[PDB]
Design a protein around this nucleic acid. Sequence first.
DNA 1: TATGCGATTTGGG
Length: 823
Amino acid sequence: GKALVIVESPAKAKTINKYLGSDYVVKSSVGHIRDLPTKDERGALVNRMGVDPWHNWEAHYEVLPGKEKVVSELKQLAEKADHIYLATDLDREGEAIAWHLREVIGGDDARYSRVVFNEITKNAIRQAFNKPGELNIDRVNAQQARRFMDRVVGYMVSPLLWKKIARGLSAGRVQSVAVRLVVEREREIKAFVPEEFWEVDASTTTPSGEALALQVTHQNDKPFRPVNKEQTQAAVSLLEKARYSVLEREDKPTTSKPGAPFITSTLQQAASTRLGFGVKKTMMMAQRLYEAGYITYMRTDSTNLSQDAVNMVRGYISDNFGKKYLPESPNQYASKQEAHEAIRPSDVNVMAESLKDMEADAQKLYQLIWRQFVACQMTPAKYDSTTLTVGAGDFRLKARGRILRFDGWTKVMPALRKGDEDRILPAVNKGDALTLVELTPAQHFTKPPARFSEASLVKELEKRGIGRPSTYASIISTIQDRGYVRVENRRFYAEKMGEIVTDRLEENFRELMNYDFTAQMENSLDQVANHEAEWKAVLDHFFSDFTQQLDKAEKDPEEGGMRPNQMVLTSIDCPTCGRKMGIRTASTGVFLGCSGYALPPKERCKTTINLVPENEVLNVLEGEDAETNALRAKRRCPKCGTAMDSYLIDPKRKLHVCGNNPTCDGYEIEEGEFRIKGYDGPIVECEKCGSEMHLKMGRFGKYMACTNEECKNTRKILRNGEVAPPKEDPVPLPELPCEKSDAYFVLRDGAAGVFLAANTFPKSRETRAPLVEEFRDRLPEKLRYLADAPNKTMVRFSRKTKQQYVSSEKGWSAFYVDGKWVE
DNA sequence: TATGCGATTTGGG
Ligand SMILES: [Zn+2]
Ligand SMILES: [Zn+2]
Ligand SMILES: [Zn+2]
Ligand SMILES: [Zn+2]
């Protein structure tokens, strides 16, 4: 008999095992084991959800597939133990995970215990098992409440979106609120218009001291800001024909305090800015550092530091830096006694280089965490700032700089590189004369609002009280690959389906899309977790406000229903029939479709032209002006002035669409001669017709399509422009049915040699290995070597040998050569 | 990468 300890990770199992001996046996349930599924209509709805809002939120949890073997293995080990310790993670999600464990195991409540720890160290684990607590039901309900609200919205708004807007549309309770933020930002940029203005730089020289770079600030006691080449040159020459004199010198002692230790949000931003880590990577690495006992729990909103940790770090600083770097009293940081702690090293003496079994990106993150934690307890840095004001004729120039006098906390956490006002100015004095050397003019433009990064969006979600440290990364992850937004060049871009759905939801679910209300809902869950509210009651108040909104939305758009997807007609003629085309938007994206679709199905034009959006490439990276210049490349709508989106119709026409589509019917067509991605592709002769075959890049790999609109004898594109042999027609088979559809099997040939696949591909997508038994009479060409035949044999393939062989099981195997077969 | 895979190249509103 012994004590059973259950965790959620083998990596977490091995590390906690180092501090548990004798009667403690640990086991890990790899992932979740129990969760929701993944009078007639309503009944089928609750079966799909696994939650009955009309029957007091009765839930029907179902064990996950492929987890049946782990549960039983965990069930067996339980009975062999006297007591059970649930060692899941700190947060509520972990509590709910621990609850699912107790539920599938069984037994009395006193048979279980809930341990809690900020870090996986000898001391911290000892303290956790010293006085284990019970499973907090209030915190579990705070999760299940959230989990239920998330599913209700997801499963009751989505079918409404299909009927009204487009198919394949998903909806999230908080995700729709995050998208709206991106959508709104997108509309601040498109509505913006960069304007031209100029700057001049006069590089001069001190009276035999050094070089002094200046910058014009004023002209005629008025701020100097020309708008074109002409006005500049007018000031340029005038500056050349002038004598430069210093007016004032202001020397001011400045400081810079270090930042607070990391919380989850601040960690993601610093890793994005300094390391270039996305939110997903940052949290993956942090979890690996946590489960290895290197850092504290990475889901936190506290900047608190334990007395031990503070004593630990202050000791290190004293030993390794000296008394100048140690403040008289510990540095305190404001947070949002929570019994929660910042993200920090578990041992300040462990360096990043001393990390075992941690990948490169995990070591970089630790170093980041380590340096911030050490610096957060060191002395402020001191500087000697000097600002110079220089007059020249009817002008007023300026220069600013500083000199490091005490590095302080920056000794352990230095900047990546120099900054703007980090130059060292030569010593001069009021009255000194400067000699002109070089005048440098520069053309600038006004900057539009900066796009969200994955981290800066989180920073915004936290500012508005939207979401929690436990859900920040899931929000960022779950708003992508939905067709609402996308991340390119480490920045968020709003898709058109984003703007459309967002607008729709704002019209029929105003409260659900409200920032403050969404923030209040997070509070209501905290209130449930703190025994200040009952969970089923909160759900009832939510579900009541939800149905009221949903009902009005389900109705027809005349009586307050949700407006259907609009359409903007173009002067574009259908290539199949003869009608004006319209710009419609789907889940997949934007395209052109014939107006001959509203007609009864007897006479509808099912022809569409996929509009391909131009690649917003900031790859040139023209500094912080990259997003600015990317906007200036856009045309302004001839109706509203809003920035337009560019699409390619054909290689001769180019469609510009207003940013406020479909609220603005504005568009333009740029006649020209454009190039597609596969313009430089190879050309080859078709086996059938004899015409040319060009390169098209589809979603299933690059391929060679014939240019004759009568045949489809294609070819596959290999690596580096190579083209495949003239293909081969598949071989069908009678009385060889499948295992899913009413389809039969056909013998194909691919990169994995020769195999056997469905006939209705890809509607079936069913494949198995052809038996040597398993035809031979219908075997085409040289494929008969396998049909020669030798436990029942089956045809295999080897990547190394690049030759096809056969094996058998129920371990026997054999190969072939230029002669025959051998075993 | 230990005897996993392959091949198709719209439709969408
Ligand atoms: Zn109310
Ligand atoms: Zn048509
Ligand atoms: Zn417009
Ligand atoms: Zn052909």
